[PDB]
Amino acid sequence: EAILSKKGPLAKVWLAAHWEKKLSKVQTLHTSIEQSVHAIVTEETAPMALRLSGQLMLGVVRIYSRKARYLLEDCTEALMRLKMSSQTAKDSLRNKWDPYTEGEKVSFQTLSAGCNREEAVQLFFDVLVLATKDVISVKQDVAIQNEITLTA
Amino acid sequence: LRTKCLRIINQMKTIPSILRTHPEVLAQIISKSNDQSAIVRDTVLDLLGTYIMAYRETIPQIYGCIISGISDPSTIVRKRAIKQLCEVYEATEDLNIRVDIASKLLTRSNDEEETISELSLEVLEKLWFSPASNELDCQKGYEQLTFLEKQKLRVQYFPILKLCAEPSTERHVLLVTSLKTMLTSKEEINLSTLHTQIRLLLSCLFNQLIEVVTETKGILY
Amino acid sequence: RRSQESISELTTVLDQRKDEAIERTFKQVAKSFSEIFVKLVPAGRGELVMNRRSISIRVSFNSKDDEQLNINQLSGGQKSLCALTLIFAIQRCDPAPFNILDECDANLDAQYRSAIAAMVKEMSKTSQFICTTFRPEMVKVADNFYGVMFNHKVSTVESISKEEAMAFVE
Amino acid sequence: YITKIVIQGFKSYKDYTVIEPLSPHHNVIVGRNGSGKSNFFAAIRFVLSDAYTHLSREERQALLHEGPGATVMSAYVEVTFANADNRFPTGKSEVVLRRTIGLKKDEYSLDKKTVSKTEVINLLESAGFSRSNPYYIVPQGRVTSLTNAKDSERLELLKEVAGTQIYENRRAESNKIMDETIQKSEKIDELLQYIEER
Amino acid sequence: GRLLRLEVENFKSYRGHQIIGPFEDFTSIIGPNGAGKSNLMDAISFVLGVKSSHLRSTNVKELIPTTAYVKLMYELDNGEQREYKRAITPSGATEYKIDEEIVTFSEYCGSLQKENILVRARNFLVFQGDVETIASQSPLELSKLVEQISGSLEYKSEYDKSKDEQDKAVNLSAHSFNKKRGINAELRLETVETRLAKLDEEFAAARKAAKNAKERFNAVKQKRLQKFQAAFSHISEQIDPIYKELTKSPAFPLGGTAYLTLDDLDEPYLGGIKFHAMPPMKRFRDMDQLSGGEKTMAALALLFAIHSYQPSPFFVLDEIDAALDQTNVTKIANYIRQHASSGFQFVVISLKNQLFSKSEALVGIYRDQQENSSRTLSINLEGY
Amino acid sequence: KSFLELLAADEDLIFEADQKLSLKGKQNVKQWIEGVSASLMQHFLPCILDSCFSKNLRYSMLGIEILKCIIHQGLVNPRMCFSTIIALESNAIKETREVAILLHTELHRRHESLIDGLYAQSADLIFSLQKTEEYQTFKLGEFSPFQSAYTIVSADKSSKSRKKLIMQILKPLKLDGIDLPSFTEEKVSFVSFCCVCLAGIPYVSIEEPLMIISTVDSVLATIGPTITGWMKKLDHERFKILAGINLCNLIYLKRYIKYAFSISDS
DNA sequence: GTGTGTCTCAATCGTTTTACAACGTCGTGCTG
Ligand SMILES: Nc1ncnc2c1ncn2[C@@H]1O[C@H](COP(=O)(O)OP(=O)(O)O)[C@@H](O)[C@H]1O
Ligand SMILES: Nc1ncnc2c1ncn2[C@@H]1O[C@H](COP(=O)(O)OP(=O)(O)O)[C@@H](O)[C@H]1O
Ligand code: BEF
Ligand code: BEF
């Protein structure tokens, strides 16, 4: 719960890792390590992931370093001090029995706009999709123009 | 070390009387008005403000090293130089230098930083038609009582007319855009308060315009 | 010194946890991909296989067998479909925040666009979507519609509700 | 989820434009062929991504509005998130972010708190976001992305969604810190042995 | 004249000897996704000999189930059906062929180029999702493209080699005269006179070499500039009328503008051909922060402007309408409809029914699941 | 006056902006209009920037106002009309040397690429304005029309662009010898104009003319002692005198460069 | 009740590293 409140030392080390090295003086530096390790080793807060564990590891090692440095400084001082439509087309074809060519399936389909343009091209795209999924076997290379036979 | 010393003397003596005995030392800091360090620039602007507050008789020959800072790249020098122009404007009485305050203010209506375009307006507002006295509320102009005609509104009124008389098409547009931007103020009360002051002005000029029906070529214009 | 040895223990346990997390997340995303892709097409197999390292997206557009159909030799439409299946499965395993889609209807057909629309309906039930198109299939699923217009050298945004699904399709 | 956005001064967006508190489910945007969609998504990416970083003078000027009204100096985008606990500072139920850009300044922020860049980077990193080119965002016509890249990059994206890159980075950094401490500890031991003798 | 037939066996996803039929003016490829519908453009690009990397594949064994070949037949406005056949021999090599006689690339490319088909710089082709990156690349490669259309690359090689010869000669002669003024300036001893005589003769030799090299340079530069200036002059006078024809919709009867500028009028190869465009309701911005639709329109206008210089016999378009609304796709459809003639053959692949709904011939492509052979049919749009 | 007032409607949103911002900053609670102007300038551009060099001040000043507006709104490609700004930078009265510098310092602040080499082209225009035949001998000391150009670009660490423009001026300084016999008086009068424009300009550094003197000694070495046995021999041609006079103009400048800063030794 | 004296927020002036763009180096794919 270290993100929410300031109870556990996990919150303090989280602040140390999250914000910066500062805003944690000597008087609040002297915290615990074993508690922090046994708090990170168990399952973390509301985000169940690993990223927060990585940040916490950075924080604990930074605190470790700073405390060791302070100990070094004190020891140096102590030394100094002691030194002293695809359906609509599928339906028309589903009904009509084999054999049937394209010209005739077009003949029984009249698009609402009356143009032998969009009706025909939509009919064509349609028979393409139908042939694309196992409806019709077709044949056109017999050197006869517009001679596609269409059969289930 | 040069930064520290001029930073120290900015509050050290609290008496510009040292410069009553050392005008050559004052001449030293006048030379550093164009240093590259943006920090030392404002220090010169602060010291030179203080020197006018007491040793007032140096309005003209000092004035030059003041407006030379408003057209500078740093914001600190501009945001400081402006506030000194405020104090100088009241203590001075030559209208011919008052107009030079205004032209250099309106020119900085827009700037690269937003805050310069912010401060520049209220410091202008504070001068032109927002006096700081009594008898400024709940009344109109009347006939030559309490000597407000030639002693109060002559700072509220006079430097206007000589700034709006420029036939240059820049002046006639730089003003009118600024006035509307001044209207959208901080909205504690935004309309009625500014009204009362300028309704006085709009009637005040009007009294001098009632002179046109009680009377001269350029004056009317 | 005791603090030092404890943080060494911490590094070890966290490394172990990382490795098990990698394994389980790979397994889950693989299963999710296979399910979504078999849902999209009436007949096909899709699966991911990690290489021998610690990936190769063996796609197949048929049911019986592949003919070593090498990726980026298939089509534009098929690989666009594969990319969408990938991101949608990754988000199915773990909910991602506020995903955004700019003109996914590029080289698809009617049927694929309808199947995209239905699965993105379900994914909208689970998470947050914003997208842009021009076609009638993606439009019928948002239940919250917008609109932009450009006039006087400025672009403005508005909010409209029904007219767009008949005005900017047909 | 995220509720409403304000953009002003941005490219093809002069004045003060706000979008409604949009719905948490699917949303669509429709308009003309060349107006204000790619710019909208570019603004959303601008406020929250790793892009527009290695900019320059003409770049940090390229993304302002150039028009006849008046020379514009700065621009800002601000988003509003209605989180519950996904973002770590759960004390704030409605977090807000904004990034202002002048011709010679940029500042990230939090709820009017003007923090530096590294902190908002760390904030978005603790949340479930990704710093680099994010998979959940696809720009114009770039949809054929994660189907033709080199497959080691696909392993990279998978290790990204599992969250391990930053883990390795901080682990190595911690190792460096450990080396500094091991030298300092050797010093400490020698000095205290001298103490003990004296 | 135009493309007439294509007979191909065992191409990628085409098993058996298929025959692709009549190609009238402005034919349209059509079919569902993922089944044919661009292997035809691929086979055209393979006949028109090109590297595999521009195609979707990355080798030459990967287009098959045995060794294959593509054979194209072309008309030359005088009845002659000249055929070009390119095969793939085992182990990965290849053999080109014209009229069933084995011929190396040289005469292939030559007798192909004589019909205004530049293959070293392919321009008549466009690939899926590459229309908008024709007007957005740096200016140096646009200059490279227009220069490849000029056909002056040996001129470029002689140019830059001669420039290296000529900075070398001039800087060496500069330091040479520096040392001469140095040495002779101290003269007032055999040392200075040997230095005089030998350095003078050395500098005279370097001078003769420099003068000769200047001549060679002036020759190659004169030829290169003749060709480049001819090309640029004829192209940069024709882009704005066709751009205004492209972008003048009924909504905006003042379409827009387009400019091709360069920095040094005398030495143009340094700064690339900068190119900018202005849609109807828009101010001046460079080709970087422009959007997708205007990028597409500008690229198509640029290609048509190229076509105004040297006409190509055919023109193959893939999905050029990826990011366009209805207005301008209807506009470009009307343009292509009223511009195709005996000199131009537009073969267009697209899905939007409004676009190809008014073609002359259609080639639809299906995929029989039994053989996985993406077979195809074709039909006319004249009886209706 | 009609054209300028027409364009002014789009720019009148400067205080009509605040007339509208009184409903925008403080909110209330055929589509040709935007595209009539941006076309009818390009159909009449090539006369606009020709009028600016006339002696009729009212005509001129009321031409430069239009040019001040077009670039400010960006209605025509600035690339086509940038080669006339520099020709208005110096060769006029003082009343216009402000605005030209202002536009020339506006584009270089935020565009930097649409204008980077055009100086080489535009310098042909200035020399094309003033006539020089047996008169107006380009003696050193005059106001070089780029006196401000180097200043405006040098307001940064421009270790590159400062070098770029001077390259665009020295383009005829070296003698490429496009055809060694054929050079005309106006053609070498051109290069003599380019000499003085390099002379009278101060610099922030000292290194950049040291390569310039390195170039002029090359042409001194390369082609000079060719004609050395020509002038002294019966002088009956114009091939050399159209060049040798030009060649001896280089020692003039090179001598002025040794005194340009009095720091070069030889 | 008025001056106090201490705590907390904003610009700016050297460093630093860090992204970026130019330049040889190989290795696969062909064609003669
Ligand atoms: N810096 C800019 N300032 C103003 N407008 C811009 C800027 N950059 C691009 N634009 C304009 O923004 C529009 C782009 O809108 P976009 O959303 O890109 O169009 P599409 O609808 O194709 O996505 C174009 O008109 C473009 O010119
Ligand atoms: N060498 C090959 N042998 C058999 N099939 C192939 C071969 N190479 C590619 N394919 C298949 O051919 C089909 C390509 O069809 P294409 O015409 O490329 O699709 P699009 O409709 O996007 O143009 C894909 O299924 C691809 O996998
Ligand atoms: F690859 Be093909 F154009 F669909
Ligand atoms: F129309 Be945007 F560029 F997708």
Numbering used by the authors:
A (entry chain B): 5 to 88, 552 to 619
B (entry chain D): 795 to 1009, 1016 to 1021
C (entry chain C): 996 to 1049, 1078 to 1193
D (entry chain C): 2 to 199
E (entry chain A): 2 to 65, 84 to 207, 1031 to 1226
F (entry chain D): 1248 to 1276, 1293 to 1529
Paper text:
We assembled cohesin onto a linear 125-bp dsDNA substrate in the presence of Mis4-Ssl3 and ADP·BeF3– and separated the gripping reaction by sucrose gradient centrifugation. We visualized this cohesin loading intermediate by cryo-electron microscopy (cryo-EM) at an average resolution of 3.9 Å. The model covers the Psm1 head and proximal coiled coil bound to the Rad21 C terminus, the Psm3 head and neck bound by the Rad21 N-terminal domain, as well as Mis4 and 32 bp of DNA. The DNA lies on top of the engaged ATPase heads, which are nucleotide bound and in a configuration competent for ATP hydrolysis. Mis4 clamps the DNA onto the ATPase heads, making widespread contacts with Psm1 and Psm3. The U-shaped Mis4 hook binds the engaged Psm1-Psm3 ATPase heads, whereas the Mis4 N-terminal handle contacts the Psm3 neck region. Mis4 and Psm3 together form a protein ring that topologically encircles the DNA. The lumen of the ring is lined with positive charges mainly clustered on the Mis4 surface. Although the U-shaped Mis4 hook can be superimposed with a root-mean-square deviation (RMSD) of only 1.0 Å, the angle at which the N-terminal handle emerges is tilted by 40°. The cryo-EM map was of sufficient quality to build amino acids 5–12 of the Rad21 N-tail, forming a loop wedged between the Psm3 ATPase head and the DNA.
Among the SMC complexes, cohesin establishes cohesion between replicated sister chromatids, which forms the basis for faithful chromosome segregation during cell division. A characteristic feature of cohesin is its ability to bind DNA by topological embrace, which underpins sister chromatid cohesion (Haering et al., 2008). The cohesin ring consists of three core components: two SMCs and a kleisin subunit. Mis4Scc2/NIPBL is known as the cohesin loader.
